[PDB]
Amino acid sequence: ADFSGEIGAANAELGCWDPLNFCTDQASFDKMRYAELKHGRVAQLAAWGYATTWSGARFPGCEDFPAGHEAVLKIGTENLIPVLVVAGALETLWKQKEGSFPGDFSATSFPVGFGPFAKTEADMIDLRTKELNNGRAAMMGILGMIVHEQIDGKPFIFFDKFEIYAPFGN
Amino acid sequence: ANFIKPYNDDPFVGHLATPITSSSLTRALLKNLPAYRFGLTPLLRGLEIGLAHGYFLIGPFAQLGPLRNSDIGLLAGFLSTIGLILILTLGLTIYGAAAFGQEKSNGSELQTKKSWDQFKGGFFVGACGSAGFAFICLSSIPTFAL
Amino acid sequence: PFPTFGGSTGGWLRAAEVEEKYAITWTSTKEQIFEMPTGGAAIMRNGENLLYLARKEQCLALSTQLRTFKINDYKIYRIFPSGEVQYLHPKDGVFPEKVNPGRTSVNSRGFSIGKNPNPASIKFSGITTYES
Amino acid sequence: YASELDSMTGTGIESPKVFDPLNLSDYVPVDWARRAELSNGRSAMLATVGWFFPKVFGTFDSTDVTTTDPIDAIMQADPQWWAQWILICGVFETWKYKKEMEGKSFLGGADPAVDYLKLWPADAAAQEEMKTKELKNARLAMIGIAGFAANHFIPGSCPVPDFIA
Amino acid sequence: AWRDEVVVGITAPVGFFDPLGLSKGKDDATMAYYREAELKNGRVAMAACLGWYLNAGGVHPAFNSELSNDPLKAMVELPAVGWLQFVLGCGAIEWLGQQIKERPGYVPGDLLGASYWVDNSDEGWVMYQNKELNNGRLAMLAIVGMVYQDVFVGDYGDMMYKQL
Amino acid sequence: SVFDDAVKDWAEEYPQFAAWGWGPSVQAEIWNGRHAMFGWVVMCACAYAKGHGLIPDADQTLDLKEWGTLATISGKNTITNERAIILIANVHALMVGLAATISPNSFADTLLLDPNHPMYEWQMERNSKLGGVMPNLGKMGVTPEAELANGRMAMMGIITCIAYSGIQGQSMIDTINEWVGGAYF
Amino acid sequence: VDLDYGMKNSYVPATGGDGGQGQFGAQSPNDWRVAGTSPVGETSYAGAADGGEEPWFAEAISTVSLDLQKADETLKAFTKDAAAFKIEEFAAEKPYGFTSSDAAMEELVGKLGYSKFLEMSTKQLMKTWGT
Amino acid sequence: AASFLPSILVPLVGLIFPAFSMALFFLYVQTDD
Ligand code: CLA
Ligand code: CLA
Ligand code: CLA
Ligand SMILES: CC1=C(C#C/C(C)=C/C=C/C(C)=C/C=C/C=C(C)/C=C/C=C(C)/C=C/[C@@]23O[C@]2(C)C[C@@H](O)CC3(C)C)C(C)(C)C[C@H](O)C1
Ligand SMILES: CC1=C(C#C/C(C)=C/C=C/C(C)=C/C=C/C=C(C)/C=C/C=C(C)/C=C/C2=C(C)C[C@@H](O)CC2(C)C)C(C)(C)C[C@H](O)C1
Ligand SMILES: CC1=C(/C=C/C(C)=C/C=C/C(C)=C/C=C/C=C(C)/C=C/C=C(C)/C=C/C2=C(C)CCCC2(C)C)C(C)(C)CCC1
């Protein structure tokens, strides 16, 4: 019913911004929340990866591969299959903690949780909100980038590629 | 529909509630201005007002003054602004003396001697500093071109 | 009991709130339109009416107009900032133009205007010939 | 010296008792002093790193500043940088004001004004110990930046490592 | 309930118009957001329309009439400093608007605070408000149509009434 | 001669100014003294620079075109760079002073005694116990007493320098160098 | 009512060239030289009116007014002496079955109100008080 | 040098002096002894 209390509400007044009324009951909300988080986490990593590659960085043995969606089209599928295998394994490993917010995998075999990062309940809520918000942004970001790549070849719109300043990494 | 009514519902006061005098826009702007805003201390009120007035004053002098075309024109403009600020500060000091007197008690009421003195001080610091900021900014103007 | 008026920019100012203020009151038998000294037109109420002004002259000017409407029950007061009120006109209940037994003479000189003293005579005295 | 000093953070192993030989506490208010001590100290802590970082670890990819000498770069850098720098500092100063008014503290108070790493201890004992460490590091930094400058202008004034120069 | 109280916006040609029922379960706050958005989007559209029309007509007496008559080309020609001022200025007004919104008694869309003098009881008031909304609704569609014509069809002038 | 009487008479003749601390008062003695002490440094620095030829391009006049008629001494003649630089140095200092006068802190020694300033009482007290003919030893170090003593000393030196310069018919800078042992030049 | 409130002012008549305090005083007891407007949540002119959210127009908020009931009192107090003189004369002219000045006043003012009483000649009064 | 006096005194006589004098007069006429 009232999901205003849930983290990620647009604002105090609008509460839950569900224009198409996708969410109807808590059961649905949990489903949608889990999905949003998953897509968000995945997207956050994706943007990081796209930028790294597009800017020019390549792993050992990957110095001739192309960047962007072009890579997926050109690079050999055999060298892409590893990704699926390393991801499917994770899919199986992550274990949802019962009676907890959607996306909490504290029950996973390897140690996972707020650990030393959070102490008070408020701290936990803040970190959670930030994870969700940054994911929401990336989700839009990765799309924005890919679209513009196809449109003009400039994935960053205002510049060709990033230049990093890593003193210690040098 | 009448958009003009007696002010404060007093038909005999010398004022009227027009859209200009009493609109959400005017009310909002005036309420949050440093002079009438709530919570600001006398010093901070002066500071904000000074910061605002000093930044725009360097312009007239710098671009239209006697040494505008000289390489030291901006520097001269800065000095001129500081001079004007000093004159205005003298005025503030003198006004306070006459309007408020010599010893005060209420405190924290912009309309007392102590508060006024603090207000004046803030104005001077803010104004002079703001003018300096403009000097730094006008030293190199960005073209915002990619 | 305020008469019906829509407001003006010619009303009272701060002096009315920090120095002194005035007020006139009267009773009417009909609702009619009068012109107010401040500027504009207003409609009096059928009965008691009260109006505030900044000067005594403004109040007395309105009284003149009221007399045209055949109203002669007007009263003028001065309200100080603290709330103190002074009844000013008609002071003794009788209009000044009508001799009322019980009123004493003030500022009267018992001689023709030409019998005042010479200025030189009262030199270095501080008084004036007309007060001498 | 002022009595309040006896009840404040600052005295430690190297300074068991209040250190105020000239009794400056008599003139400058105790509160203002601590606020200033931390402010100048925190700023100095940052400076020390900035004095050598560009030289030791490289510079950004631009040509506005060609020198690496800490003092020289001041004039080489574009004025626009300096203006924006003053602005950011002003923003920080405002944050401290607003947050303090909300009851938060930037001076070892119960509610941190800036704890993005969320590492402020809850127990008062640890809090006290944590504050002492900051003050020390701050005092040390102020001395250090001064020393660096000294050797820079009057060579030999201070024993500074060559790379720091 | 917003639906049971709203009076402005419901006119003669179609009456209440919500074929897709996008406001059936929305609360008063959401509905208020919608009305404010509707008015703002519409008002901005009306202004844009006038701007485009003037430029297209050739009455752009600024910068020595250097910029092109094509509105979309002109935007590219405008220095960024001009654009920055625009965004920042509008942003300022947006802030002030937020202050007004917070004040108690805010009627969605009213920045002049006309509520102080007039209410929706007056039919003249509601009618004039309806005119703003109706013209705004039309303007929104128009600005979208014109852009299509300029970007795809290739013209930035009237192709409807031009033929006397 | 009793000093006190003369001061009293001044206050009576010019009461308005006396109220703020103007005139023959301890406040003035302190402030004027502080300035004199500071100046000695400036004057010595000027002497050193002059002798060691530090001032850039001295003995040259500023351009009447770059600068204006404000830089003219007589007709089209303009001020030399040296004097201009010396003045700018002093202006740096004066600016600091103006800020301190117009925008005093809550724990600072204000130029004038203001009943509405928090430091009024302390200042009034300090001044009340800082008057004497002979420097009060036993209060050496950083004390109000030391400050006043040193200030009087500095002010006296200024007077002496001017007089000696005149008697010996030399510039004040020269006398300074002489009293230092000719080190600067 | 302090009938001397106005007279008790700071005005001091000069020697020559001044009419004086007159009958109701020459100047208000209060000084008009008050301050200007103040920030929200503050007051300036002593017992001033809080401007609420519009401190800029605070001076337009009235705080000085006339109570109709109080108005009656001021009328009576300032005209007390006149009433006294009037009734005294009525008493002097051998009133029919007279009682007490005050009593007569009440009776005579019970009818003919008070204002009418002040504006009536002793003759009319005697005619009225024949009963 | 005395020649510098015109450029040191005129600024004072025509600007500083008049200002302070006017200020003092204002303070004198606005005070209620
Ligand atoms: C009144 C008309 C007028 C105007 C416009 C000017 C203009 C100028 N004179 Mg001139 N002058 C005038 C009359 C005028 N003069 C007269 C009558 C005399 C004889 C006494 C002189 C004698 C004179 C001399 C001797 C000199 C000048 C100089 C100057 C220049 C310097 C400007 C300056 O420093 O102003 C500074 C201005 C300000 C600090 C404020 C300007 C007013 C602001 C902008 C108003 C803002 C209002 C605002 C929009 C309200 C809305 C705000 C809201 C939106 C928030 C400038 C070109 C100098 C020069 O170099 O000549 C070219 C110079 O040496 N003037
Ligand atoms: C900014 C866009 C916008 C918004 C937010 C609204 C919002 C509203 N309109 Mg409305 N309207 C618009 C544009 C908009 N209108 C336009 C352009 C027209 C002209 C056709 C109308 C004509 C119209 C009528 C005739 C009536 C309303 C009414 C209403 C209100 C109740 C209906 C409702 O809930 O709609 C919900 C709408 C939204 C939540 C947003 C609209 C959905 C977006 C725009 C999806 C985009 C669809 C569209 C096809 C995009 C393509 C456009 C173009 C490329 C072809 C509501 C406040 C009714 C009213 O006032 O009752 C009180 C009413 O009777 N509208
Ligand atoms: C004897 C009195 C006197 C003197 C010495 C000056 C001197 C000057 N006037 Mg001037 N003026 C005077 C009377 C005087 N004025 C009168 C009576 C009027 C009214 C008609 C004017 C109206 C006037 C105008 C309208 C302008 C001048 C300007 C100037 C300056 C032009 C030269 C220059 O280099 O400008 C370049 C400026 C500088 C190099 C800056 C110099 C540093 C400033 C002056 C410091 C001021 C600080 C000062 C101590 C503050 C006063 C404090 C207060 C207590 C007195 C010059 C400083 C022009 C100017 O630029 O004003 C500054 C100008 O626009 N004057
Ligand atoms: C006649 C008489 C008496 C008397 C007397 C006497 C002897 C009166 C004499 C009083 C006397 C002789 C008082 C000296 C002042 C010197 C001052 C103030 C110097 C200031 C110096 C300052 C402020 C320094 C300024 C500078 O630093 C600045 C500003 C810039 C630098 O570039 C350079 C310098 C350093 C210069 C009696 C007997 C006592 C009582 C009797 O009843 C009346
Ligand atoms: C250095 C320098 C220069 C510079 C420079 C620099 C840095 C300039 C900096 C400019 C800058 C920061 C400008 C900043 C603009 C910000 C704006 C409008 C914000 C509006 C916020 C709004 C509406 C908020 C709305 C709200 C929303 C909806 C949610 C609600 O719940 C609550 C709420 C939050 C209230 C120049 C430009 C001066 C040139 C010079 O030569 C050199
Ligand atoms: C028309 C209009 C408008 C308005 C406009 C205007 C009027 C503007 C102005 C503006 C301004 C007028 C601004 C200002 C600014 C300022 C500044 C920005 C400053 C700064 C400063 C600083 C930052 C600092 C300084 C300092 C100090 C404080 C001291 C020490 C030193 C220093 C330097 C640090 C708008 C758009 C709204 C809208 C429409 C209408």
XYZ file of C-alpha atoms in Angstrom, chain D:
165
model
C 47.385 30.799 32.146
C 43.604 30.568 31.883
C 42.027 28.000 34.195
C 39.814 26.498 31.502
C 42.925 25.200 29.785
C 43.212 22.768 32.674
C 39.972 21.146 31.551
C 40.641 20.893 27.817
C 42.154 18.467 25.329
C 45.752 19.167 24.368
C 48.028 18.269 27.253
C 49.767 14.939 26.729
C 52.869 12.815 27.217
C 55.229 15.387 25.697
C 53.232 18.134 27.391
C 51.942 16.784 30.716
C 50.646 20.200 31.781
C 49.257 23.272 30.043
C 51.897 24.843 27.832
C 51.461 28.604 27.882
C 54.752 30.122 28.983
C 53.810 33.649 27.922
C 50.235 33.289 29.161
C 48.720 34.247 25.819
C 45.575 32.603 27.132
C 45.105 35.756 29.150
C 44.524 37.744 25.982
C 43.060 35.430 23.348
C 39.823 33.770 24.462
C 40.267 30.058 25.117
C 37.519 28.977 22.737
C 38.660 31.086 19.816
C 42.165 29.784 20.323
C 41.175 26.138 19.979
C 38.987 26.856 16.988
C 41.905 28.631 15.347
C 44.417 26.020 16.437
C 42.489 23.309 14.666
C 41.671 25.434 11.631
C 45.233 26.516 10.935
C 46.394 23.011 11.761
C 43.993 21.181 9.486
C 44.796 23.505 6.619
C 48.495 23.012 7.275
C 48.114 19.251 7.288
C 46.843 19.500 3.733
C 49.564 21.919 2.671
C 52.411 19.693 3.720
C 51.240 17.054 1.277
C 50.697 19.628 -1.442
C 54.202 21.009 -1.044
C 55.792 17.899 -2.513
C 53.009 15.831 -4.078
C 53.154 17.453 -7.489
C 56.932 17.014 -7.592
C 57.214 13.495 -6.243
C 54.213 11.915 -7.971
C 53.806 14.045 -11.088
C 51.432 16.750 -12.271
C 48.140 16.927 -14.143
C 48.253 16.976 -17.937
C 48.312 20.710 -18.560
C 50.789 23.495 -19.238
C 49.405 26.341 -17.142
C 52.056 25.712 -14.518
C 55.503 24.658 -15.697
C 57.498 24.968 -12.485
C 57.304 22.536 -9.605
C 58.668 24.879 -6.961
C 55.830 25.273 -4.490
C 56.113 29.053 -4.208
C 56.609 29.782 -7.898
C 53.515 27.893 -9.002
C 51.401 30.378 -7.088
C 51.769 33.028 -9.778
C 51.956 30.675 -12.756
C 48.565 29.138 -11.979
C 45.665 30.768 -13.803
C 43.782 33.343 -11.750
C 40.558 31.441 -12.440
C 41.837 28.585 -10.319
C 42.467 30.904 -7.418
C 39.004 32.410 -7.610
C 37.357 28.997 -7.573
C 39.639 27.974 -4.721
C 38.456 30.861 -2.587
C 34.900 29.908 -3.447
C 35.281 26.296 -2.340
C 36.825 27.405 0.932
C 33.911 29.754 1.453
C 31.520 26.885 0.885
C 33.354 24.836 3.473
C 33.220 27.716 5.923
C 29.484 27.999 5.359
C 28.982 24.290 5.915
C 30.695 24.514 9.263
C 28.414 27.383 10.219
C 25.147 25.789 9.169
C 25.956 22.388 10.612
C 27.114 23.876 13.890
C 23.796 25.675 14.127
C 22.112 22.304 13.731
C 23.833 21.183 16.910
C 26.577 19.276 15.128
C 30.226 19.918 15.963
C 33.465 20.179 14.030
C 35.488 20.463 17.205
C 35.401 17.023 18.789
C 31.746 17.284 19.745
C 29.262 14.457 20.161
C 27.732 14.717 16.696
C 30.341 14.905 13.941
C 29.868 17.598 11.317
C 31.999 15.789 8.757
C 32.403 12.035 9.139
C 31.974 10.636 5.646
C 34.018 7.588 6.600
C 31.770 7.029 9.617
C 34.689 6.333 11.960
C 33.771 8.519 14.938
C 33.762 6.387 18.090
C 30.627 6.318 20.226
C 32.342 5.831 23.575
C 33.606 9.084 25.056
C 36.893 7.466 26.020
C 37.782 6.617 22.442
C 36.429 9.922 21.259
C 38.805 11.733 23.563
C 41.734 9.648 22.424
C 40.816 10.228 18.793
C 40.707 13.982 19.255
C 44.129 14.015 20.873
C 45.669 12.284 17.895
C 44.256 14.841 15.483
C 45.501 17.755 17.533
C 48.947 16.295 17.645
C 49.179 15.622 14.014
C 47.885 19.140 13.432
C 50.484 20.766 15.636
C 53.206 18.725 13.994
C 52.013 19.723 10.532
C 52.016 23.421 11.273
C 55.615 23.131 12.396
C 56.478 21.135 9.308
C 55.040 23.486 6.726
C 56.808 26.351 8.444
C 60.034 24.399 8.331
C 59.665 23.619 4.657
C 59.183 27.277 3.872
C 62.147 28.259 5.989
C 64.548 25.955 4.191
C 63.062 27.158 0.923
C 63.926 30.801 1.491
C 66.765 30.632 4.001
C 68.580 27.435 3.063
C 69.802 25.300 5.956
C 67.278 26.725 8.390
C 65.624 23.331 8.746
C 66.654 19.716 8.182
C 64.371 18.787 5.276
C 64.689 15.691 3.089
C 66.014 16.445 -0.387
C 62.962 15.232 -2.295
C 60.629 17.362 -0.204
C 63.010 20.237 -0.811
